Amino acid sequence: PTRFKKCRHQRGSTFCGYGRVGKHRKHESGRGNAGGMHHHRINFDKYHPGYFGKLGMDHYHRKKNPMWKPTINLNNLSRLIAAEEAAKAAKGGTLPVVDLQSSGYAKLLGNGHIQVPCIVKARYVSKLADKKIRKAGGAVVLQA
Amino acid sequence: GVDLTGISKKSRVIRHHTYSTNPYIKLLIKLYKFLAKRTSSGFNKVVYQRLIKSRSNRAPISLSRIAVVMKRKAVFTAKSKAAPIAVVVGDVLDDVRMARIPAMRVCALRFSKSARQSIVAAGGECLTFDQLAMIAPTGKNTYLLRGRKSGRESVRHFGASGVPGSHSKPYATNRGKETKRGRRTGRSYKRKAFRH
Amino acid sequence: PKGNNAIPHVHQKKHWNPCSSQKGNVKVFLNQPAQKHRRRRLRLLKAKKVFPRP
Amino acid sequence: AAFKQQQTESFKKAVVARKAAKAALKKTAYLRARKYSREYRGAEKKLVTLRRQAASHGNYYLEAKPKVAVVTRIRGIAKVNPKQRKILQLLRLRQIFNTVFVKMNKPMENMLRAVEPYIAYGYPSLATVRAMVYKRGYLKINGQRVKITDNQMIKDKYNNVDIVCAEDMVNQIYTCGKHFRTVTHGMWPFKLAPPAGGMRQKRRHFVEGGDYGNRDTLINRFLARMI
Amino acid sequence: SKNHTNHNQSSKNHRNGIKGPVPLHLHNSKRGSWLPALVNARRVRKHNQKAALKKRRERIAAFAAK
Amino acid sequence: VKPTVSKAIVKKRTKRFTRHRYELFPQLSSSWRKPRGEDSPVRRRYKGQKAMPNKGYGSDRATKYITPSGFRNFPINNVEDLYMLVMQNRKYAGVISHTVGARKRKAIVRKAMELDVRLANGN
Amino acid sequence: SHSVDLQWVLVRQNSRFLQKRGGIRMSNDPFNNNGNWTKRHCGFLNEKAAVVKPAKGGAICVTVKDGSSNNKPRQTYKKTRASDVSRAVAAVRPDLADVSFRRARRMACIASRTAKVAAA
RNA sequence: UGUUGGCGAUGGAAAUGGGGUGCCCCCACCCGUCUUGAAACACGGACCAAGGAGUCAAACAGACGCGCAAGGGAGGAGAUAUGCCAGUACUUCUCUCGUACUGAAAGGGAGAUGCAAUGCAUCUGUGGUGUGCACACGUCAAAUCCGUUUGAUUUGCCCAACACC
RNA sequence: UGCAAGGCCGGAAAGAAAAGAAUUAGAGGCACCAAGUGGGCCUUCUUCGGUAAGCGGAGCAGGCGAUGCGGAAUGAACCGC
RNA sequence: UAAGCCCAAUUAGUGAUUGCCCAUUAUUCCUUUGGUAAGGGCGAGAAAGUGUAGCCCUUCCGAUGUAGAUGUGGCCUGGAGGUUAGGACGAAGCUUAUGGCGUGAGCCUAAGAUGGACCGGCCUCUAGUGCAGAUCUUGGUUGGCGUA
Ligand SMILES: [K+]
Ligand SMILES: [K+]
Ligand SMILES: [Mg+2]
Ligand SMILES: [Mg+2]
Ligand SMILES: [Mg+2]
Ligand SMILES: [Mg+2]
Ligand SMILES: [Mg+2]
Ligand SMILES: [Mg+2]
Ligand SMILES: [Mg+2]
Ligand SMILES: [Mg+2]
Ligand SMILES: [Mg+2]
Ligand SMILES: [Mg+2]
Ligand SMILES: [Mg+2]
Ligand SMILES: [Mg+2]
Ligand SMILES: [Mg+2]
Ligand SMILES: [Mg+2]
Ligand code: NA
Ligand code: NA
Ligand code: NA
Ligand code: NA
Ligand code: NA
Ligand code: NA
Ligand code: NA
Secondary structure, eight states: OGGGSHHHHTTTOSSSSSOSSSOOOSOSSOSSSTTTTTTSHHHHHHHOTTOSOOOSOOOSSOOSGGGOOOEEEGGGGGGGSOHHHHHHOOTTSOOOEEEHHHHTOOEEEOOSOOSSOOEEEESEEOHHHHHHHHHHTOEEEEOO | OOOOTTOSTTOOOOOOSOOOOOHHHHHHHHHHHHHHHHOOOHHHHHHHHHHSSOGGGSOOEEHHHHHHHHHHHHTTSOSSSOOOEEEEEEEEEOOTTOOOOOOOEEEEEEEOHHHHHHHHHHTOEEEOHHHHHHHOTTOOSEEEEOOOOTTOHHHHHOSOTTSTTOOOOOOOSOTTTSOSBBBBTTSSOBOOSOOO | OOOSOOOOOOOOOSSOSOOSSOOOOOOOOTTHHHHHHHHHHHHHHHHHHHTTOO | OHHHHHHHHHHHHHHHHHHHHHHHHHHHHHHHHHHHHHHHHHHHHHHHHHHHHHHHHTOOOOOOOOOEEEEEEOSOSSSOOHHHHHHHHHHTOOSTTEEEEEEOSHHHHHHHGGGGGGEEEEOOOHHHHHHHHHHHOEEEETTEEEEOOSHHHHHHHHOBTTBOSHHHHHHHHHHTOTTHHHHHHTBOOEEOOOOTTOOSOTTSBTTTTSSBEEOGGGHHHHHHTTO | OOOOOOSSHHHHHHHTOOOOOOOTTSSOOOTTSOHHHHHHHHHHHHHHHHHHHHHHHHHHHHHHHO | OOOOOOOOOOOSOOSOOOOTTTTSOTTSOSSOOOOOOSSOHHHHTOTTSOOOOOSTTOOOTTTTTOOTTSOEEEEEOSSGGGTTTSSSTTTEEEEEOTTOOHHHHHHHHHHHHHHTOOBTTOO | OOOHHHHHHHHSSOOTTEEEETTEEEEOOTTOSSOBOSTTTOTTTSSSEEEEEEOSTTOEEEEEEOSSSTTOGGGSOBOOOHHHHHHHHHHHOGGGHHHHHHHHHHHHHHHHHHHHHHHO
16 A cells, blocks of 8 residues: 555655765666675675585486475374274274375384374385384385 | 763663454453452463563464473372463464373463364363453462464574574575585685584 | 575566567466356357257 | 442541551651750760860860761763763762762762862751751652652651651761661752852862862852752 | 774764673583593583482472372 | 633644745745755744744643633534534534535524524524 | 443444544434443443433433343333432433433423523 | 722623734844855756656565464366356365475484383373473561551472573 | 582571771663664864974864854854853 | 953941842743653543543653654545535635634635535545655746837
């Protein structure tokens, strides 16, 4: 809305908040990111360390679909089980089955304490996750 | 003329009234301003002060944190006394990382649907502030709680990233762009990770 | 006095804006509901014509 | 009507207690004033006899050094150095013709010596202290400037069994008692009028024919035209 | 076109005052000190933490039992 | 009806604050504009110049908005407007709007006379 | 379910009964005994209400909202010396006694003056 | 807070405030600008009307308002009320930002306690210490209409937050 | 069982006397977002260059710039405020 | 025989205390406005309240300012969604020794011996939204001048 802007508060004041000594002029420092090495060096070096240079190897035709690999944690595993099966679950008997690749995940990581034993089907798994789930009472089955 | 130099630098910036547009918030403020004026308790004064604050200064709290602090208070309490009422001026959100919790009475401005369901399933009650004003008009036997503020992305961005000792994130949309010069010793220099 | 902002890459340095000297290069969507209505009407007519085939 | 009856009964009980407290405070103030008057007379007489005894034998009598000073600001707020500005702020003389009582010890004398061209000071008398408390005495109550109008305000402000009336305040200030700092810190700075009849020269020392500096017990005539 | 002065600088510095130093008990880091003593201090701190946990457990048990 | 009595009205200032130098240019209006010239004598507060409005010229709140008759003005547009004035008789007087016609003005004046409501521009 | 405090918060700033002319705020409400725009006198939103009105001849009619038939707009208000009028009002609303007393006196005086100008 | 006179008897009245013009005593350099400094022998300046200058889009950030919350939300498109209606009502699938980071890369990937030295056992749980709202339990002052307040402090748990590990 | 370091437990405490033995228009700490400015000039003391200067260059503080009012007949900066 | 210069007094060797003139300063009284504000209440009168014609009463302190920042139930202009109203018994526009109100931007009434068909208040929404000066733009006028 134009009625809330600062220019409506400034009608009658000649300079509009820019001063009589240093006026409001077109481009007093250059256009764009000009001068990042000469006269804007302090700004660049103190707020954006690492802007200039090269690092690492190249990869000419990157495709992200072969690189798809999302992750989920043991203490988060309960989002993928329905409430009734979670209540019915108990170590030593019949456990719920979780399909990570159908739920949208690829790798199982092992942070935290597992809140319910279950059988997990995953493409990948880590050492700690495998060990912890085996101790809890569930199991992990590799899929493709 | 009186010499009062630097006397405006003693002035403090407080709020004193709410910017919220919520009629129910206004009704709650009307109740607790009266209570804070006519009652000697400090609980009412603190609650009134926190109802006036902005949304960013009323951070949400978690069910797991509520359970943990309540248990740590309960271990050292007589076996015949009753547990207190957890009070938060803010929202209560759920935690999927904690499955089983005790039965607690909680009062808050808002509950998630999942938080409400979890509390009632465990065996507790979700109260409102007008119900609290009738159960505990002075705030006796209550636990006043606050939610966590650090860990917000804005807080982690505050500062200058290129001065020694500084570990704040830069404002950048490409994650691989600002590495190299000023971040690796192979380039000109690397900013120091520690300073006394 | 540029403080702590991002480094901008807004990419608007060609003659896309139509003015007194430039034709422009823009595309607006102000005919979206009209075209949606037209498509639905055509589909209904075609189904009526080819009935009883799916 | 139970609430109204309880309220009116409580109020009827409170009024009589207020009257009784007034009655007791009056007697306490009377007794203290009488004893202070006796003490002043006795001290004066004792000094007189001691001086006469020395003079008869041909020795000298050395008087006790003054313990209290009264300081007033005679210059306005313009072109003041940072150090002297801070000293005047610490002494609570931020306006012209403001007055305070200070202890005349070493830490305060070395402060008064550094702002001399701005002040006039000297050693007050009982009449001066009494007049400045009765005519132009104000207290600090909840951060406000309140004029002294009865002894109940003094009692409530100071909350000390040694300070319950105005004669207690006068005695403490005059004799530099154990509550000198409490009594003087609980007061607003005195705000006086310009001296009727004029000054001499605010730019010279009193010894040179001007106004600033220490003028001993001649400050009383200066203040008698300002209070 | 090149001039230098220190005229208004003290007043500017004292406007918001010269802030005093931080108390010595805060920001009392030990990084960069003598390593042989640093290592022994770390071992003692670990033992102290274990002792504190045990003491709390004992307190809890006593309160529960009596 | 008579109004409620009040203190005497003081009116700190009666003259108006007019613009600087509007008497020399026909196109300048007399309404007040704040002068912002660097060398302006009115802005710099010289001795013989005209004054600028302050908060100190404000009027006593006990008598603010009271007209010389002792009432305060409330604008009315028809007959039904008098019924909400009939209860605050000694505080408010009605002012008939400029654009109400003669036909309606007759009825308004008659009703106000019956109800004992004062009209500031009645008839 | 929706209380008078909530309704007042909702309508305090704009309503068809609020007349803000000049800098003065009055009330057009037919169930207001004062003309003031306050929650006490806003009789169209209160649960109980009573208003004194002039009736034919020299009669004074008091209209009372008991508070039981609200949500039935055609049954919300049932009709009915100044001391008697005040006692009638105080049954419904004790805090409406003085204003109703004064309003009854004013209505009687208006009737007498109208009879005077009728004779003249 | 009363008392005594004058003018005013319904007029072309009297009175009190506004408004207009003249006069007397006093006060008072010409506006806008740039400049350390303008009344300047420094630039612009005969009169009036109408017009005349921080706006639209797009990326990011901080503060404030609102909805939902370990999740939030589309967009494009479709379906039928719908055949006044460029609006409103409804929607599967997906996509995107977030819940996890780190390495040039091949790649790897975060709980606590106890006992031991890809180890074993339990799981209602702040990893520890210092400074720390409210609440609970004691104690002492001041004031008191005697009912309680206003203060201080001891201990328990300490929420948010900061310092050291 | 000496010294060093980190803790637990218990005790004392004019909570800082007396000797000129402080005072305070004396609430401490921590962050976030942004403007204008980056031509200065005068005076008191101290001064370097220059014959000197209403000249050039510095140190400490106060002013004008950004400010009227009362005085020095008049004056950016003097005296009082 | 200073109305000059250097000293010194205050009504004069008679005996306690200040010759007198002038500030946007000091003291005091009245009014406004704002607080890091402080208390009380809930015959005409009182609203549980940031901000108004302030809910009502008492109390204390501050008040200038260029470049610059911020606030305002602060003023004004063209249009949209609502609500409440006016007009041939005279709308908009225009004129003023027409007063009243407001610190002010401004609002309102009166008279027209003006006009002849449209338009006001309040709550939200919206923008090509406020002029004294740019050797500003377009139109009209003007002194010089009954002159060269
Ligand atoms: K320079
Ligand atoms: K006026
Ligand atoms: Mg290379
Ligand atoms: Mg985090
Ligand atoms: Mg800069
Ligand atoms: Mg800067
Ligand atoms: Mg062209
Ligand atoms: Mg003199
Ligand atoms: Mg100018
Ligand atoms: Mg992250
Ligand atoms: Mg300048
Ligand atoms: Mg100002
Ligand atoms: Mg300005
Ligand atoms: Mg337009
Ligand atoms: Mg005229
Ligand atoms: Mg324009
Ligand atoms: Na600039
Ligand atoms: Na200037
Ligand atoms: Na310019
Ligand atoms: Na000028
Ligand atoms: Na600049
Ligand atoms: Na410049
Ligand atoms: Na114009």
